[PDB]
Amino acid sequence: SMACTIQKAEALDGAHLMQILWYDEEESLYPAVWLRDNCPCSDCYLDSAKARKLLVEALDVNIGIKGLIFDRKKVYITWPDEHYSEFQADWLKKRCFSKQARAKLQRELFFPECQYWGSELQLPTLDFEDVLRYDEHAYKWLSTLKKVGIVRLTGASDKPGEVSKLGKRMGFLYLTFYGHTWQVQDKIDANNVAYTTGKLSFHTDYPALHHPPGVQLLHCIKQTVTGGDSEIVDGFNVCQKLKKNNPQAFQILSSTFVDFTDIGVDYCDFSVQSKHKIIELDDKGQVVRINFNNATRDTIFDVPVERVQPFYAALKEFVDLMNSKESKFTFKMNPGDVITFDNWRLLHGRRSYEAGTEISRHLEGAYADWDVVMSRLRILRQRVE
Template identity: 40%
Template structure:
């Protein structure tokens, strides 16, 4: 079976250039530990920044610090923020990295009685007017600098730009054993899922349970009404159109849920003897292209809510309904903080504070689009014209390939549409896929764990 679009990445790509192998430890050894869990900022911290001067400004309500360096040589920290983030054992639980300071006992006008640096300039010591004492490592403060360029850098390093792709795309492939055993490969796979929205894991064992095994490298599979895993096979009285031999148009799974699962795994255990070719296309790329070429259709698909419905019984009985435009992009008005800063949200897949109104979730699925349309009569034909324009562009820009037994197709289920050609249903050697979903929260969590330098320092 030909598979010309596969390639193996030779370089680390977007991975961080400093990484510590292995899991961060679950619990710190000492209750005095404040872990340096800050995504990607390990380099500065190892510079061991020192403070050379500090003073409290009553007028500004801040402690001002001068660092032992030329660039960004000073920083300011508000009194109330310092008090709220006291690291002493009665204010903070290090093992939970959680605050015990209660808002009811916090005074927004709190003031220090005295501020000073320890002998080496490694800590800021504060005595508060009520007698409470706080002590902050210099590196900890420096990581929390309020300067606009520092804030922007922190937010930028949390997000990766999406890389849209069309019909010329090649899907990156990773060996199953490498993903299971090597943290650098795991990280590259997950970064591809974030930026490209698709990657293949190849040479997985040809047995059930491998989606769950892959998910456990991240966190766990998300259970849905179709179960923890689902089996794609031609069935009698199928609960889903996927469980037939029919052609499936390009679509995203489970758009009838407000919480649409993030990433989908489809593991080919046995391929069809004939047919069943897989197709994938980048919904974000299609949306962008549609916006340029057919702005009327784009407008309809971003504005007109469409109803999705799934009713039946599989893992549990269900009657799921969701109503949303095909191309979902959200803008939240943000007059208070800068819109540019707000756009740097950490959650590109939901509630994105995105000034450009970029799509963050696609809801295209003709199979489960409700026959009940809650749109005005005169919008019906324009909606079909727009759906057809979208579908045509999607097929014009899709890639097609045959899944081989052992291949696990992994893709962003809110972005990348998948489909398959019809195949002949036979009794022997039937086509058999197993699927599952993993939520984006846990994928980003795993990327952060892989990229975090676990750098315990006693407070």
């Protein structure tokens, strides 16, 4: 393309910069030190690993270009210490430091597109076996999971082992103290409120961990008619509404460290403690994770006394917003249904149901790391494209 063809290349600014004039008449600037740092020759770069061999120690941060020649597709550079580098035009173009270029590349790397939703949610639904079998369907699955925060898979069996197949489709599951997979059912001497018939209000799973699970998989094996409906809410949407309606509540929940705890025995014996802000913001002030499970929020609360009641007042507002008819989406899982969702963004709940002699309700669940999911998503996109 004209955009990726070199019309002129030259060293500028004490030879500390290279400028490319492209044939579309746009110009790009590349710091000399970055070029040297990213020399792709076999001394500096290990092709089989696609990784840098060059040490920081070898880099003169005040380096300038000693010599430069070019043709339409390549730049050829000599450095002051006689090192020699070649850079490809398309490789340079992609890495252009302009905001527009960098932003475009970031979107391609990290799939930032996000669709907020409330009670109007149309639950994205795909077939289980299709997803396992076809890359086009697995791509739709993971891309939708990232964008919308949840996908329902229908047509799985009513037997354990289904979430493990999805785990393999992704890469591998995220092991925790509750196992590689775990059975959500009523249990004698339950080590977790999830393993009872009680109502679960909106929560994220495992805030007791510093790194809570990114993605949750829940497969319905048995369902009861006496209750047990699922409820979800878009935590990012709720946070936006909270900041608007009650900035003071938002400020408290996005700045106060809450202690979470989990003690007991399952995969092995554990005694787990963490601290999270319930609304976790990035350095730009955007919400990147919600960390909230009212069951595992500790009795220990590490704040001064005067901050305690305002925190609870803020928390109540947040929960009231989640429960709003405009915010929450309700549905009931059937045997063979699997839901897969963003556990950093969505909060989920379940309605109480009745206990009985034998098991009337059974889900099998598992977790996955977002980096594992994003890796598979990147690869799938490449295969389908």
